[PDB]
Amino acid sequence: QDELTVRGLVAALLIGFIYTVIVMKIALTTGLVPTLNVSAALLSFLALRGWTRLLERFGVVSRPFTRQENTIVQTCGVACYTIAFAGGFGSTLLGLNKKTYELAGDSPGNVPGSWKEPGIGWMTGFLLACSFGGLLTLIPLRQVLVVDYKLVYPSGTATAILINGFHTDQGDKNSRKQIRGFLKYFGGSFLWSFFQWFYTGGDACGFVQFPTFGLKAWKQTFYFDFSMTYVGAGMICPHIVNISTLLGAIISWGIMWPLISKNKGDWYPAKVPESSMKSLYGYKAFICIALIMGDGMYHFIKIVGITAMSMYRQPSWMAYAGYALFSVLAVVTIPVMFKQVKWYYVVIAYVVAPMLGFANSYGTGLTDINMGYNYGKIALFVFAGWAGKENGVIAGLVAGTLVKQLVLISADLMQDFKTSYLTQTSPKSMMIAQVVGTAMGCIVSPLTFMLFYKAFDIGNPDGTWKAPYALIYRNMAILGVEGFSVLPKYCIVISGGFFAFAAILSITRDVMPHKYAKYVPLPMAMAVPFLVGGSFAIDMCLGSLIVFAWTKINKKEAGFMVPAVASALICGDGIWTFPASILALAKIKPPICMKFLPAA
Amino acid sequence: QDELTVRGLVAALLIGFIYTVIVMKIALTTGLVPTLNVSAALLSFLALRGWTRLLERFGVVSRPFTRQENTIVQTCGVACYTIAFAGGFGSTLLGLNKKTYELAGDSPGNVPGSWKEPGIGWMTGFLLACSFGGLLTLIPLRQVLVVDYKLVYPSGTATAILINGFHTDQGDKNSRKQIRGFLKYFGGSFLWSFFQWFYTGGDACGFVQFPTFGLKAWKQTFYFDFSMTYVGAGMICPHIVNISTLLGAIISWGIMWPLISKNKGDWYPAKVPESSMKSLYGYKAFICIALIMGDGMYHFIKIVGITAMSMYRQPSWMAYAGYALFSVLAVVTIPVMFKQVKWYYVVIAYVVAPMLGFANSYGTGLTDINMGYNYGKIALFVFAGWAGKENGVIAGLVAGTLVKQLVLISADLMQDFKTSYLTQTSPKSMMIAQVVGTAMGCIVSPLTFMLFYKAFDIGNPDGTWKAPYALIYRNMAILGVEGFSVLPKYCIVISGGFFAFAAILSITRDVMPHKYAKYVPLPMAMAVPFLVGGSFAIDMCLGSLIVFAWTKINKKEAGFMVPAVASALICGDGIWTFPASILALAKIKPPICMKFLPAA
Ligand SMILES: CC(C)CCC[C@@H](C)[C@H]1CC[C@H]2[C@@H]3CC=C4C[C@@H](OC(=O)CCC(=O)O)CC[C@]4(C)[C@H]3CC[C@]12C
Ligand SMILES: CC(C)CCC[C@@H](C)[C@H]1CC[C@H]2[C@@H]3CC=C4C[C@@H](OC(=O)CCC(=O)O)CC[C@]4(C)[C@H]3CC[C@]12C
Ligand SMILES: CC(C)CCC[C@@H](C)[C@H]1CC[C@H]2[C@@H]3CC=C4C[C@@H](OC(=O)CCC(=O)O)CC[C@]4(C)[C@H]3CC[C@]12C
Ligand SMILES: CC(C)CCC[C@@H](C)[C@H]1CC[C@H]2[C@@H]3CC=C4C[C@@H](OC(=O)CCC(=O)O)CC[C@]4(C)[C@H]3CC[C@]12C
């Protein structure tokens, strides 16, 4: 009790509903889904405190609003609208339409019978079959990642400190300074993000696209964006993670991509545009996943090996028993909706999902970057190649959704579990909130999507309701119909080499003594700057430099003030994401565009 | 003794010589003469300390290098290169050439016999006749302005604190914090100015031309440039000065100029470009000088009235006796060089010079802005109208130089006297340094100018050595040949109205009780934003806002730390002016141009 409340369920439903509308409409118009996890924590506090104070004003007495209750409300609210974008409503499930089929055009794999129309009944059934699969895998993941590996989730840590500060009324020698120090940088970060908004009024202009080291380095993604989220995240991360991130940027963007791009006419065709698996993006996706798989497989096998040895020498199996039940339920249900999907396609997806989900959850616990979109695109490509021209596009799209959603749900909610750990929230109550929130998400989102779908015209390339990613994901399946031959030359060989390189580094860190194991780079921390630019790496290294400078200047103060200052920078930028979404919701666009030119 | 040293004279000659070359070449190529007063103080310290330490390394003993000696060296050095730009070598004396005469073209007033060629003999004689006139007027001005009126010269105050910090080795509870606090902001301001340099690579782009309130307000000069000099200057100025500066910007740029510009076809011709006395710049120059004259005349008359009453009831006259001697020497000498100039033209110039010099020196003591260039342009216009088409262009140019130089010398060296006051430097030793420095300036500058003039081609509009202001000043004289009829409609009436308005405000402040005299705006502080934009006013108000916020937060700390922090911001930007000049000297230009566009 005192954590699961009726008022909390009502507040979570309201927050989950309004956030679903914001996420859905933005996805159906621009496709740039914002991260609104931090804003939900603030809205949960304001809504419930206002309700309690309203009762106080009228004389009605209510139960005290504690920090554990606030975490549960955010947890239920987050899972409600997470399905809105993790379910592929604007990316993959929208790519099954006949409208998207016609936009793709006449091409191999795009057979006349590979289009599906949206509907409330099948979408709700599709989500319920697969949404409750990731939740069961989370229970074993919480122990190994949050409490055993002690991974720091910067978004989870920042939200936990924010939630604690709201409910911390104790007067201590440090508590007062923690809150006041948090407020000074929270307001500054929010105003800084608010100020930047007026000058990001075009393609690649603003403080985000600032060439701090010149235009030549900026085009190589080696600039410094003024993002306090990445600076704040890097402050609470260990230096080895921040250094490893810089190495990945230098190896990929400073060495590898310039060298590989020198063969734009020999290795891969030059007529095809970039950002496609046939041209220079095959290297981006496959090498990046190779590093994570090379490191993720070693860790996952080691955990199984340790567990196997412990049992041989002698609720963990309860979660997997329930996971198998939902896995079978999905296997018997999904091919009924889609004749294209075969029964064993779903079995393979569910078998490798805990492994893929573990890798992304582990990666999110180091660099605060959720790479579940990359896994869905890779899973879409391989599954599309597992079927011929017939029943291939739908097979890739549907199988991609299962992998994309389960992996995204895992990483997103692991940070939410990190918040519960720091706020002394009961894990069993957290499990109930996610199940209730996910169940409502599987009902609200299909209803919300159909309300937009029926009222407006979605998918028109020359209209307000344009979904660019619906066609992009459709083209990935069409290109994925053909096998691995479409990948550029030496793409598999280099990926296999980096798989070995990732494997060697993982082994090297656990075999060498602890003295020399503090300097081995992390293979999957280096993998993040392979898809995103090196600007993220520079920001993380700046955060470590600030902590390194602060620690030397004042060892005592930096011990307890760095988490508070780092959280304020993350929260302040995170809070502004809600007004920025509303401005984007109301078609209000930035007035000015701060462009940089080479003294033309 | 201990202030006038042989090593100081040698160092001042070297600093004065190198600064003359930098000022002369920049004036002959771009015309944007930098303010290098702060950089001279640092170079004086480094040069002499290195000389003393070199003697220490070799075992040679030397007299201790004190703060008074440092002030004298900067004083002699500043006066040496001040004549380089205050003498109109690149603006007015270059406008007398036959090359400039041909560029002006066929127009009334530009008679065939109104060109003069440069020469070492007459230029040296011309300067010696008029350069030592302003110095004598300074001696009475020091008492009334520096010590009696207690005007704060932000550049003089900042240099004095910088010079004191170099020679302050005492260990006190506050002295250590004063120096360390100065160093933190001095390095930050220097790096900030250094960082901005790479992005100001074009016409109106960079952090200086930042539309902090939108593009509409920026075109109205109501933006916030990131200039730490103006922010630092406003911190040590009283709030009434900073508020009055904002009022002048709102009245002129927010009300007057938009309304007057609405008559671009009726009041003044629209074909003629702006920034000319015939179109919208007559209002800028005449109204701005009207406010200063309205306030300056009241103060100057009051000082004479107080002095007259004191004598009636009963070295001041020594300075004026010497000033009259040089005034007569100029009168008998200048018309010999120029047949165009008549004897009584010089007499009128020297009679009104102490009045004009007092007004600019008083204005420089409030807003740290030297407006002697405006007086020279106004003096050029009226004196050109005092002669017909014959002997009119030369009469305006020559008479403009006397007014421009004497007024510029007064304001520039009054800040130097403010430095001596705070550094406990002997005023009589300061007088000797200025005379020696001015005498060398009248010799080095004509030699330096002729070295460039003989070696290269100066005045070519399509060459590296282009002097835009030489022709602009030439056109002012040609337009000034015709009388006050060329001024736009109602220009004199509005200027006369603001003359009364300035007079009323000056009287109102001294007649009302001290309780209500703290809120009367200063007429000549409002006059500064009439020529420059309102961005300067905003920066000054930001500095007052910082002090107002700092004082409320910590009354004790803001008492002694504000001058140190304000000086560091001014000095840091001032020091960078020297490397920026060297980069401009070596034809090195900024790489990037940070342009702002309306989301085109
Ligand atoms: C003490 C700390 C704060 C150091 C400050 C960081 C410097 C190492 C950075 C800041 C500005 C940077 C410069 C910003 C811009 C350029 C322009 C760039 O020239 C271009 O190529 C621009 C486009 C073009 O000219 O074609 C060359 C690198 C350079 C000098 C960068 C080099 C590295 C600099 C000096
Ligand atoms: C200390 C922390 C806070 C970050 C500071 C990093 C920068 C000072 C340095 C480190 C890595 C450097 C980069 C390392 C590698 C490259 C690759 C190089 O790319 C190419 O070789 C061009 C290839 C082509 O022509 O396409 C251009 C310089 C650049 C961007 C360097 C620019 C300056 C960077 C970003
Ligand atoms: C708490 C403190 C820090 C307040 C922050 C200052 C605000 C009062 C300033 C900062 C940004 C300013 C905005 C910056 C840019 C614009 C664009 C401007 O639109 C334009 O006209 C741009 C050119 C065009 O669109 O044609 C309208 C004013 C506005 C909203 C400005 C209004 C005033 C703002 C919000
Ligand atoms: C508080 C301190 C630190 C300075 C902050 C000042 C700004 C918040 C305000 C004060 C004065 C304002 C200005 C007052 C007057 C005008 C005149 C107005 O000009 C016109 O009427 C346009 C004329 C034309 O169309 O040519 C445009 C708005 C502007 C620039 C305002 C923009 C916003 C300003 C700069």
Numbering used by the authors:
A (entry chain B), B (entry chain A): 46 to 359, 393 to 678
Report text from the authors:
Poaceae species use a unique chelation strategy, whereby plants secrete a high-affinity metal chelator, known as phytosiderophores (mugineic acids), and reabsorb the iron-phytosiderophore complex by the yellow stripe 1/yellow stripe 1-like (YS1/YSL) transporter for efficient uptake of iron from the soil. Here, we present three cryo-electron microscopy structures of barley YS1 (HvYS1) in the apo state, in complex with an iron-phytosiderophore complex, Fe(III)-deoxymugineic acid (Fe(III)–DMA), and in complex with the iron-bound synthetic DMA analog (Fe(III)–PDMA). The structures reveal a homodimeric assembly mediated through an anti-parallel β-sheet interaction with cholesterol hemisuccinate. HvYS1 comprises two distinct domains: a substrate-binding YS core and a scaffold domain, implicating an elevator-like transport.
The cryo-EM map was reconstructed to an overall resolution of 2.9 Å with an imposed C2 symmetry. The structure of HvYS1 reveals a homodimeric structure. Four CHS molecules within the HvYS1 dimer are assigned, and two of them are present between the protomers (see also “Dimer interface”). The N- and C-halves in the scaffold domain are pinned through a disulfide bond between Cys250 and Cys671. The overall structure of the HvYS1 protomer represents an outward open conformation, as the central cavity is wide open to the extracellular space, whereas the base of the cavity is sealed from the cytoplasm. The scaffold domains from each protomer comprise the dimer interface with a buried surface area of 936 Å2. In addition, a cluster of the hydrophobic residues including Phe240 and Tyr244 on TM4, Phe252 and Phe255 in the TM4–H4 loop, Phe271 in the H4–H5 loop, Met672 and Phe674 on S1, pack together to stabilize the dimer. The side chain of Tyr451 in the apo structure points inside to occupy the Fe(III)–DMA binding site.
